[PDB]
Scaffold this active site. Structure first.
Site: not given
Ligand SMILES: C=C(/N=C/c1c(COP(=O)(O)O)cnc(C)c1O)C(=O)O
Ligand SMILES: *N[C@@H](Cc1ccc(O)c(F)c1)C(=O)O
Ligand SMILES: C=C(/N=C/c1c(COP(=O)(O)O)cnc(C)c1O)C(=O)O
Ligand SMILES: *N[C@@H](Cc1ccc(O)c(F)c1)C(=O)O
Ligand SMILES: [K+]
Ligand SMILES: [K+]
Ligand SMILES: [K+]
Ligand SMILES: [K+]
Lengths: 455, 455, 455, 455
Positions: D70, D122-123, D213, D256, D380, D447
């Site tokens: 942990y 970005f979304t 980003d 990515k 897109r 979307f």
């Molecule tokens: C999921 C996609 N994009 C994620 C993305 C994100 C968000 O990341 P996560 O999907 O890992 O949350 C942030 N910034 C940029 C430029 C991104 O392209 C996609 O383009 O399909």
């Molecule tokens: N629920 C788990 C994990 C956990 C959650 C919040 C905290 O502040 C922790 F230190 C640990 C557990 O019982 O450890």
């Protein structure tokens, strides 16, 4: 009786058996804070049972069949049908772990000013309730606050406190009832099927929703099978299914009773709330079909939840924790009672009755335990309680404890003997344990990085 | 007195026990030969420590780095340099397991009509010696043949018997000395460094070659560290390296002390023998650059041999076996003594005193252990000893034993308790074990697939 | 037409893209012998299609479910029922790879002085036949020895040569017919179903046994489906099943068409021979239920054989090799024709017609290919043919070739373009390729460790 | 012109295509939203390059070395030091993926009513900015909004627009500048180092913070090496490290360019922001020592980020995408130009000129691509752009595109040929693509799960 492991070892994790003198140096470099210890320097790591579990060969096979598609993963459909079968809920949304699901539930189910009532609370769960406008009300039975009271199903909600809340605040002003299984803050105490049915039948008469914090629902189901009259002929899976028949949904940390290292999910029966949950999960977690998990982890969690239904596995899990508690209790070491499903809590206040709470007896006892044995335990006392930033005073919890938290399928009884023998040896010379003082205290999350030295 | 596991469980595999009625059906369907039972029909499988070990997280990481090239694999280089460093031999030829290396050695080093002398026979080793025209001579000291005699280093060669063989036959008529560490069929008994040094000195003076059966050399090294004067402060690695300094080469089943599920190798110092070995390995095993192993298995075995050098690992390995023997002996269960490195041998002659060795009490005891316990064990008496290839009669060993063989890093002390408790209960009605007779006997290595029936 | 890969990449293997000048230094350190090159220095390794295949995600899942029991492994039962279903043989014995099974077959089926007849031969197969007393007779059709003759099913046995052998030697003096699919020595040429039926019907009339060297039987089955009239409506699995219905058994190297890195097995229909095979496998390989393989590898081989039946996979496998041959042929590069199922063979005699065979044109061409592209290829010419130890003269093979052997599911068409473009560039300046001379020649296995320098 | 894959295939997963009749059923069952189709019903899945990458053998080895503790996990330390070394930031907080880091940043760095300015929206990024009270301002140069305009470094911020924002609003009213590399919704367009340096100089003079980003920063670095004067001899690692020297922190989706299937992190240099980030990560993700990731995933992502620095890997990655664009453009298929780092964007406005943007031609084109090809692609355009949170109307972007998104190390050029050939055939009857209208619209990030019907 203590059963043998109902599994054998498929593969092992390498550890560094460093000796006592070197352990002392590691403890000093960590400022006598076990949270600052390096994993590579720890023999037996009992910091937490969250996400530290050993997976099976079947789960690892599933880890090789991750369908990593962004939408429509086969692993998600496997997880969905598993949770629908075993828990009985209509809709499931994966989340990366438990507090991701709590975030979703609290945003979906709480209007500002409403109350949420529960059998005690957990820190992240209550944070998301209060962050979204709820006032928390503890409706646990009064006995749950007697840490030395050895009675069954200490986690049960007091139906009279629930009725009082409905009468005084009004049903429309109660967002939901939050029923946790087991009750972590009481030491991992179970809730009876009879309490779960009573709560469902009182809330249903008033239109009040009930959501379960189901993170250790399988340990809870074992206690029901072991101790609640009438469940001797029921399988764990039958008991789990009936438990969740008294809820409108749940939040689940797979990291506990689903026998995995990451993962969780949100369940509910209401179509409308499920539609809103899908609109929200994309904000914080990911698609409704992965929710911030790799495909392989949805697959591991689907397999693990099903493995957790095996009676022999969950019996041994709980009885191994009980072996540790029983051995300590037999030597006179003070513990919270009864022993819960996942951990033994030492009463550091009584263990170190020569120390004041301002001398952090639990923090110091946890440091001594590591030095003597190579076991890491968690401080659950004044340090973790934090400091009141307005007044500058400690939060002073009644419970000053050290948590020996047992990961699932990771350790043996011989490891439990290492832990117990070391604690018992310390207890026989407990007057020698020294108090601690801050030498570095961060403004927040002080349990995580604070450093100490001996007084 | 009994250390805890010097590792954690990383992953598991479930175990189960089928009812006694079904085990009884399975045992007669296997013709009362434990070798013929199915893996799934077994709860705790102590048939053998060969290839049944649990690998570590580091080995499994190496399993993902298999370089499967036909020549020049990184995994081959890693294995070669690890064995060169830890054993000290000049050349290494990988083989798919130990009897592949024995096949090569016997063809390379035996002229027909010559003698091979060793510290007690072993089944595959002696077959490859005799198939290539040698006569086996047993030069272990007499004590190694008495089950109950508790003396240290029972595996030692009798130097007087070795001297006599040289005098009567002549050094040129002796292909080599075969010195096994430990000595499997004596109960897993160790050989002292003093004996390895004395054998080296006497053989070198006559120009006789010495080849080691290295299969359990690390268990052997532990006994040296524990019990031989002057070695208490030497590391396991240092002892192993010095052990092999008294040898001209070795055969190794990695499946034992290299902590893997497949693999082995042949070592030698002589250039011309290595050249001949490379020609021969292509016929039977594969190119000298993989020897019938996948790249990932050469990697696992190189990593495993080095893990085996960890003192705490091998101390626990040996003492886990000793715990099982200690519990059986404290209850009056007759065993081979001292307890060896890898297994406890029940003394079938004393367990089944109502039976003669022609009624195969060892074979019969292993069947009855399975029937009443579901634990699988192996016959290690007259059935394994085969027939005299001149008279056609049974070889009649004094050691008529049933082997409880412990895979490395697979089971816990609680599993040992289950085994011990079940054998202890069976001990109290040992008169019920019936004698057996052949209905199908293979013409060589007959114990593997022989089928019997009660008399 | 060249189809796209009928799979996507689940995981990749890291390579060291070293540039041309560094490749030259690696080639010189290897003494211009590609067999001495390190795998880590090779971009595209076309030394062999044996055991170099990429496994699927399903096979890797099976690799996590190795039942490593010494007897009765679930993985063995999976392999057994798979081979029984897909090949149709009654009994199967696993071996660690192909030449382990050949060892068993030749010891079981040959009396000294008998003949074994085949459609050409493979080195290990013929060695085990001759080692056990057989005289080898080539009964392949004469066209198979014309390396430039582009006709279908070049591997077919000449039924007239088989009849002549029966008439001249007598049926009782013929141990068996060894029918290989495909025929490696002819460049990987297939055999028709019609030839397999004719051979079965002639041998059956005389009581003669037929055993298949089935190592590339799936490529063979693809050629039958592509080119033999009447098989357009048959699945690969249907064709494979019918192929083996004309044999009494087979030896199989899983390392080729079972899509694994290690493994093989022996099949037969005769109960008595199966009983003798079980008595023999324990001598060289292991138990009849693991045969020198880890449980996880029996599992991988069982899964892989079944994957090899998918039409799209085997079509793409063969057509990717054909893409390489076609591209070379289109630029005028001389190759053996037709292109086989597993490799393209360059005609180094014609490629380097400015060099004599004593200047090792294939060895030199293979060194040039690696230097220009990072592709390793195998010399299959005068060097591999070895030296006559009695007369000291080279064995002078008619075929002086470089083998571009393509592992299954490892490379793309772009990799095939790297190979072809580099060879074509070399062909455009082929007169610049220099001859080689020995600077180190071992007495045996000279292709494996010989070192050269330029003339 | 198009390099071969700088790696081998280590393992595979099969692909399949269901008949057009079934794809048609599936598309209407998904409500004509590609996000709702199932993974198994898809042949080549180009929905997204996020989390769909193939990992290497080294990453899978690290996956076997998960240290699931942990706190103090070796995997956390490895990730922390790798990011510190390669990106140069002082502090790192892991998050389960990129939008978890965006959640933290927006809560830490935005006072309600302030402006966030970036190079195109970005979304998820823009939702977390607006949810925390910011107004988004687009300061990318105008050219980035014209699909067909082929100019280098389209992602660059317009310094005049940034200067104007500072003048009209005041520096204290700007929370930070959000500079994305590459710019996803402009087509994956890169940002020059000159622009990153000029943005740093102008923001620092006004005390304005700059957060990157970083999600496709390595693709961005490749464009700098390929096309920006003076960078042709700098390594990818050097360019990446210099890029982030102009930033105060970053959000990163490891999914990515870190070549993993899950994971991300938040970086910053400021101590007080890091302290606040650790408090907030516990609420939403997990302890700062794992951030909602299993240990094995922090390990995979640390290994993957370093693999991404290999020039040959990223050159091939980008040129594989370019090959697809080049083949489509040579056939007259309208695309966004220049081709970006991760995807080809078909110009839905020109593909579907018979449709207005209120008929959602991008959404409709992605459905029709699936129906006629089984390849999955992503909308897109207007559907992704969401609604104005003041007027309730569609955001109307000039870029109405359909994204063919290439996961890293998964597909071959032959797969690109299949995609291109199928789009080229569809191009010749583009008039058949019907318009769509909403039947279910989520209230945010619509979307993801919107459902449509033909008009
Ligand atoms: C999921 C996609 N994009 C994620 C993305 C994100 C968000 O990341 P996560 O999907 O890992 O949350 C942030 N910034 C940029 C430029 C991104 O392209 C996609 O383009 O399909
Ligand atoms: N629920 C788990 C994990 C956990 C959650 C919040 C905290 O502040 C922790 F230190 C640990 C557990 O019982 O450890
Ligand atoms: C299989 C066993 N022994 C194998 C063995 C062998 C043969 O090794 P393989 O099983 O790896 O062929 C050689 N030498 C000794 C001392 C051995 O114990 C066993 O004792 O169960
Ligand atoms: N059959 C395989 C492997 C093989 C066998 C014998 C040799 O001497 C080799 F070099 C390789 C093949 O065709 O490579
Ligand atoms: K974890
Ligand atoms: K095994
Ligand atoms: K291999
Ligand atoms: K994923």
């Amino acid at each position: 009786n203590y059963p043998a492991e109902p599994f054998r070892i498929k593969s092992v994790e390498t550890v560094s058996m460093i000796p006592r003198d070197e352990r002392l140096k590691k403890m000093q470099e960590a400022g006598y804070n076990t949270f600052l210890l390096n994993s590579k320097d720890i023999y037996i790591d009992l910091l937490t049972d969250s996400g530290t579990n050993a997976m099976s060969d079947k789960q690892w096979a599933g880890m090789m069949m991750g369908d990593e598609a962004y939408a429509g993963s086969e692993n998600f459909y496997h997880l969905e049908r598993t949770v629908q079968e075993l828990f009985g809920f209509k809709h499931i949304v994966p989340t990366h772990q438990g507090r991701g699901a709590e975030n979703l539930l609290s945003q979906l189910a709480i209007k500002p000013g409403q109350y949420v009532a529960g059998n005690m609370y957990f820190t992240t769960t209550r944070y998301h309730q209060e962050k979204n406008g709820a006032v928390f009300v503890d409706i646990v039975r009064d006995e749950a606050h007697d840490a030395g009271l050895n009675i069954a199903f200490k986690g049960d909600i007091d139906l009279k406190k629930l009725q009082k809340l409905i009468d005084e605040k009004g049903a429309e002003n109660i967002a939901y009832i939050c029923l946790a299984v087991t009750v972590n803050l009481a030491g991992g105490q179970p809730v009876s099927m009879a309490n779960m049915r009573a709560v469902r039948e009182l809330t249903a008469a008033h239109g009040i929703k009930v959501f379960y914090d189901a993170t250790r629902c399988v340990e809870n189901a074992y206690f029901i099978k072991e101790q609640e009259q009438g469940f001797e002929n029921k399988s764990i899976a039958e008991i789990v299914h009936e438990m969740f028949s008294y809820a409108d949904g749940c939040t689940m940390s797979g990291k506990k009773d689903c026998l995995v290292n990451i993962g969780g999910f949100l369940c509910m029966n209401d179509d409308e709330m499920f539609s809103s949950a899908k609109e929200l999960v994309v904000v914080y977690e990911g698609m409704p079909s992965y929710g911030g998990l790799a495909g392989r982890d949805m697959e591991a969690m689907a397999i693990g939840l099903r493995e957790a239904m095996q009676y022999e596995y969950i019996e041994h899990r709980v009885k191994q924790v009980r072996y540790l508690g029983d051995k300590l209790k037999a030597a006179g070491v003070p513990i919270v009672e009864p022993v819960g499903g996942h951990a033994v809590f030492l009463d550091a206040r009584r263990f170190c009755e020569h120390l004041t709470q301002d001398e952090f007896p639990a923090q110091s006892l946890a440091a001594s335990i590591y030095v003597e044995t190579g076991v890491r335990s968690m401080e659950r006392g004044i340090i973790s309680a934090g400091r009141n930033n307005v007044t500058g005073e400690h939060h002073r919890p009644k419970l000053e404890t050290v948590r020996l938290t047992i990961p699932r399928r990771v350790y043996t009884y011989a490891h439990m003997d290492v832990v117990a023998d070391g604690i018992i040896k310390l207890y026989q010379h407990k007057e020698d344990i020294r108090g601690l003082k801050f030498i570095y205290e961060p403004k927040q999350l002080r349990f995580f990085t604070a450093r100490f030295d001996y007084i």
